[PDB]
Amino acid sequence: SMQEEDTFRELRIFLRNVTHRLAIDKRFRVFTKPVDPDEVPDYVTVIKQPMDLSSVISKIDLHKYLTVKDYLRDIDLICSNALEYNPDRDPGDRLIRHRACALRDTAYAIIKEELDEDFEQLCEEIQESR
Numbered sequence: 459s460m461q462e463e464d465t466f467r468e469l470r471i472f473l474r475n476v477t478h479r480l481a482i483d484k485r486f487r488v489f490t491k492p493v494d495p496d497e498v499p500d501y502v503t504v505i506k507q508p509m510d511l512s513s514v515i516s517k518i519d520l521h522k523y524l525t526v527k528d529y530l531r532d533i534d535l536i537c538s539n540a541l542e543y544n545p546d547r548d549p550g551d552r553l554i555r556h557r558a559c560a561l562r563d564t565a566y567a568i569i570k571e572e573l574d575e576d577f578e579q580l581c582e583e584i585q586e587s588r
């Protein structure tokens with residue numbers, strides 16, 4: 459119905475806003491764009507599902523997230539990809555990992571403070587029924 463279309467529109471507005479806030483944080487600059495295959499040629503061969511915040515924005519806009527849980531799975535994927543691709547003890551790898559964890563923690567903290575749980579439940583139930 460139009461009431462359901464309005465729910466999902468509110469979801470998209472909410473998710474763009476959260477993603478924007480992550481995207482303008484200087485710690486998370488590394489996560490704002492897809493990894494450049496010139497800059498990092500073995501990335502695509504190691505990491506099977508690349509994800510970054512620009513792509514998250516494209517996915518919102520393509521109506522790919524029907525719940526906040528589905529969004530958080532992609533935020534999780536940014537983080538897990540960074541942990542897996544950069545596993546070593548050296549400071550380069552530790553910096554990116556720490557940033558990856560801070561990205562994930564921040565996304566979850568914003569959603570905990572700002573997402574109404576009954577709004578998420580509504581989205582899940584509309585999604586369950588389609």
Ligand SMILES: Cn1c(=O)ccc2ccccc21
Binds near residue numbers: 489539554
């Ligand atoms: C996320 N990420 C990595 O996980 C590894 C290298 C790299 C290089 C440029 C930008 C992002 C990058």
